[PDB]
């Protein structure tokens, strides 16, 4: 077959009911995740190949970066709660991996304030139980798919993308194969 179970994707032994149709896990400490976001724009190209309005979800993980990694999961919950993902993703990746200026929770906050989120608004969100529930949702989703590495993408809670075997000599062709594979999986 052109798309083979065990090759370009793997079938979860324990499917996840009610899972988002497209579910991505990442860490701001994760180098391939930085590439997937700012160099390849995987999510945006996957979105362009899927039907209008399909549910795409992106969650942060705790298992990289120790204490600051877990602060970033909570900051990503703030980003989701406020709808400012597109304003903070690049500066958070740069702060962790490029400049290494993000060393504390206060440095994470600085990124949000520089991006235009008012300090009072950030602090109210950070301390809110809406954000605690989003943190719990991110942890539970990772536990559901039994997650040990990022970046990772899961489709309809049933299939995991496997990019390892794909030709990466041309970034545009790779991104196209990735997105067409997500499309194929979503149509199964």
Instruction: Pick the closest to residue 134 from 93, 83, 73 (CA basis).
Output: 73
Tokens 């067409």 belong to which residue? 180
Nearer Cβ to ligand SW0 (26/159): 26
Asked if 84 touches ligand SW0 (CB under 6 A), the answer is no
Nearer Cβ to ligand SW0 (83/129): 83
Asked if 61 touches ligand SW0 (CB under 6 A), the answer is no
CA distance 182 to 184: 5
At closest approach, how far in Å is the CB of 39 from Na ion?
A: 20
At closest approach, how far in Å is the CB of 176 from Na ion?
A: 5
Nearer Cβ to Na ion (32/49): 49
Tokens 């993980």 belong to which residue? 61
Q: Which of 20, 65, 69, 151 binds ligand SW0 (CB under 6 A)?
A: 151
Question: Residue 23, exposed/middle/buried by CB under 10 A (0-12, 13-18, 19+)?
Answer: buried
Nearer Cβ to ligand SW0 (120/178): 178
Tokens 């324990």 belong to which residue? 14
- Kind of pairing, strands 22-26 and 9-11? unpaired
| Tokens at 171, concatenated | 């970034």
Residues that bind Na ion (CB under 5 A): 180
Residues that bind ligand SW0 (CB under 6 A): 24-26, 33, 36-37, 42-43, 58, 89, 151-153
């Amino acid at each position: 077959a052109q798309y083979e179970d065990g090759k370009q994707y793997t079938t979860l032994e324990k499917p996840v009911a009610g899972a988002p149709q497209v579910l991505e896990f990442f860490s701001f400490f994760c180098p391939h995740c930085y590439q997937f976001e700012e160099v390849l724009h995987i999510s945006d190209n996957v979105k362009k190949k899927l039907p209008e309005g399909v549910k795409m979800t992106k969650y942060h993980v705790n298992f990289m970066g120790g204490d600051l990694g877990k602060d970033l999961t909570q900051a990503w919950a703030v980003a989701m709660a406020l709808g400012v993902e597109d304003k903070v993703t690049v500066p958070l990746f740069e702060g962790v991996q490029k400049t290494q200026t993000i060393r504390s929770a206060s440095d994470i906050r600085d990124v949000f304030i520089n991006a235009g989120i008012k300090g009072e608004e950030y602090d109210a969100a950070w301390n809110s139980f809406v954000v605690k529930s989003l943190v719990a949702q991110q942890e539970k989703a990772a536990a559901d798919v039994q997650l040990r590495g990022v970046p990772a993408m899961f489709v309809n809670g049933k299939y995991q993308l496997n990019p390892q075997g794909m030709d990466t000599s041309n970034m545009d062709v790779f991104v196209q194969q990735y997105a067409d594979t997500v499309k194929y999986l979503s149509e199964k």
